[PDB]
Amino acid sequence: SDAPNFVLEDTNGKRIELSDLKGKGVFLNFWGTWAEPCKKEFPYMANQYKHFKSQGVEIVAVNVGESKIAVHNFMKSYGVNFPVVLDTDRQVLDAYDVSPLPTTFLINPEGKVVKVVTGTMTESMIHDYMNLIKPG
Protein backbone atom coordinates (compact mmCIF):
# COMPACT_ATOMS: atom_id res chain seq x y z
CA SER A 1 0.00 0.00 0.00
CA ASP A 2 1.14 3.48 -1.07
CA ALA A 3 2.04 5.79 1.80
CA PRO A 4 -0.11 8.97 1.67
CA ASN A 5 2.07 11.85 0.55
CA PHE A 6 2.50 15.10 2.47
CA VAL A 7 4.51 18.27 2.67
CA LEU A 8 5.20 19.70 6.16
CA GLU A 9 7.92 21.91 7.46
CA ASP A 10 10.64 20.61 9.68
CA THR A 11 11.55 22.43 12.89
CA ASN A 12 14.07 24.64 10.97
CA GLY A 13 11.44 25.89 8.48
CA LYS A 14 12.46 23.54 5.68
CA ARG A 15 9.82 21.99 3.42
CA ILE A 16 9.84 18.18 3.48
CA GLU A 17 7.88 16.10 1.00
CA LEU A 18 7.50 12.40 1.60
CA SER A 19 7.63 11.48 -2.11
CA ASP A 20 11.03 13.23 -2.41
CA LEU A 21 12.51 10.54 -0.13
CA LYS A 22 11.93 7.74 -2.70
CA GLY A 23 15.15 5.69 -2.99
CA LYS A 24 15.48 5.75 0.80
CA GLY A 25 13.72 3.74 3.51
CA VAL A 26 11.52 5.98 5.72
CA PHE A 27 10.99 5.37 9.42
CA LEU A 28 7.87 7.46 9.79
CA ASN A 29 7.04 8.17 13.44
CA PHE A 30 4.01 10.00 14.82
CA TRP A 31 4.63 11.33 18.27
CA GLY A 32 3.60 13.72 21.10
CA THR A 33 5.65 15.16 23.95
CA TRP A 34 3.22 13.64 26.47
CA ALA A 35 3.72 10.01 25.26
CA GLU A 36 5.89 8.13 27.72
CA PRO A 37 7.18 5.72 25.04
CA CYS A 38 8.46 8.59 22.88
CA LYS A 39 10.55 9.68 25.88
CA LYS A 40 12.14 6.22 26.01
CA GLU A 41 12.32 5.60 22.29
CA PHE A 42 13.57 8.95 20.98
CA PRO A 43 17.07 8.31 22.35
CA TYR A 44 16.99 4.83 20.74
CA MET A 45 15.95 6.23 17.35
CA ALA A 46 18.69 8.84 17.62
CA ASN A 47 21.26 6.18 18.42
CA GLN A 48 20.07 3.87 15.59
CA TYR A 49 20.08 6.90 13.23
CA LYS A 50 23.85 7.33 13.76
CA HIS A 51 24.10 3.90 12.09
CA PHE A 52 21.29 4.04 9.52
CA LYS A 53 21.44 7.55 8.12
CA SER A 54 24.38 6.74 5.85
CA GLN A 55 22.73 3.46 4.87
CA GLY A 56 19.78 5.20 3.24
CA VAL A 57 17.15 5.11 5.95
CA GLU A 58 15.60 8.45 6.83
CA ILE A 59 13.55 9.23 9.97
CA VAL A 60 10.57 11.58 9.64
CA ALA A 61 9.24 12.19 13.17
CA VAL A 62 5.83 13.89 12.76
CA ASN A 63 4.82 15.79 15.89
CA VAL A 64 1.03 15.74 16.24
CA GLY A 65 0.11 19.45 16.41
CA GLU A 66 2.04 20.92 19.31
CA SER A 67 3.76 24.30 19.49
CA LYS A 68 7.23 25.01 18.02
CA ILE A 69 8.50 25.60 21.57
CA ALA A 70 7.11 22.39 23.16
CA VAL A 71 8.69 20.40 20.30
CA HIS A 72 12.07 22.26 20.53
CA ASN A 73 12.13 21.62 24.27
CA PHE A 74 11.42 17.91 23.74
CA MET A 75 14.12 17.55 21.03
CA LYS A 76 16.68 19.22 23.25
CA SER A 77 15.86 17.06 26.29
CA TYR A 78 15.94 13.76 24.33
CA GLY A 79 19.04 14.22 22.16
CA VAL A 80 17.25 14.35 18.81
CA ASN A 81 19.59 14.14 15.76
CA PHE A 82 16.95 13.33 13.16
CA PRO A 83 14.27 15.19 11.16
CA VAL A 84 11.15 16.45 13.00
CA VAL A 85 8.15 17.88 11.12
CA LEU A 86 5.17 19.75 12.51
CA ASP A 87 1.71 18.51 11.67
CA THR A 88 0.12 21.81 12.84
CA ASP A 89 -3.46 21.16 11.58
CA ARG A 90 -3.24 17.46 12.42
CA GLN A 91 -3.89 16.78 8.67
CA VAL A 92 -1.14 14.19 8.12
CA LEU A 93 -2.15 12.28 11.26
CA ASP A 94 -5.75 12.19 9.78
CA ALA A 95 -4.37 11.06 6.43
CA TYR A 96 -2.49 8.28 8.21
CA ASP A 97 -5.47 7.33 10.39
CA VAL A 98 -3.18 7.48 13.46
CA SER A 99 -4.94 6.32 16.62
CA PRO A 100 -2.60 4.95 19.22
CA LEU A 101 0.43 7.10 19.77
CA PRO A 102 3.23 6.62 19.00
CA THR A 103 2.70 4.90 15.70
CA THR A 104 5.46 4.11 13.21
CA PHE A 105 5.01 3.40 9.49
CA LEU A 106 7.85 1.54 7.80
CA ILE A 107 8.05 2.82 4.23
CA ASN A 108 10.31 1.04 1.73
CA PRO A 109 12.42 2.77 -0.99
CA GLU A 110 9.49 2.46 -3.46
CA GLY A 111 7.12 4.45 -1.20
CA LYS A 112 5.03 1.60 0.13
CA VAL A 113 4.11 0.91 3.73
CA VAL A 114 5.57 -2.47 4.68
CA LYS A 115 4.67 -2.46 8.40
CA VAL A 116 2.70 -0.47 10.89
CA VAL A 117 3.99 -0.46 14.44
CA THR A 118 1.91 0.43 17.42
CA GLY A 119 2.83 0.11 21.14
CA THR A 120 6.36 -0.40 22.45
CA MET A 121 9.68 -0.62 20.67
CA THR A 122 13.03 -1.72 22.07
CA GLU A 123 16.22 -0.42 20.46
CA SER A 124 16.69 -3.97 19.10
CA MET A 125 13.27 -3.73 17.39
CA ILE A 126 14.08 -0.26 16.08
CA HIS A 127 17.33 -1.66 14.61
CA ASP A 128 15.47 -4.56 12.96
CA TYR A 129 12.80 -2.26 11.59
CA MET A 130 15.35 0.01 10.00
CA ASN A 131 17.10 -3.07 8.48
CA LEU A 132 13.73 -3.99 7.01
CA ILE A 133 13.44 -0.77 4.98
CA LYS A 134 17.00 0.03 4.02
CA PRO A 135 18.07 -0.24 0.34
CA GLY A 136 21.13 -2.55 0.97
Contact between residue 135 and residue 55 where contact means Cβ atoms under 8 Å apart:
yes
Overall resolution, Å: 2.4
Please name the amino acid found at residue 66. Answer: E
* Segments of the chain assigned E as strands: 7-9, 15-17, 25-31, 57-63, 84-86, 103-107, 113-118
Q: How far apart are CA 22 and CA 112, in angstroms?
A: 10
Query: What would the CATH number be for the domain defined by 1-136?
Result: 3.40.30.10
Write down the experimental method used for this entry: X-ray
**Which residue, 76, 57, 106, is CA-closest to 11?**
76
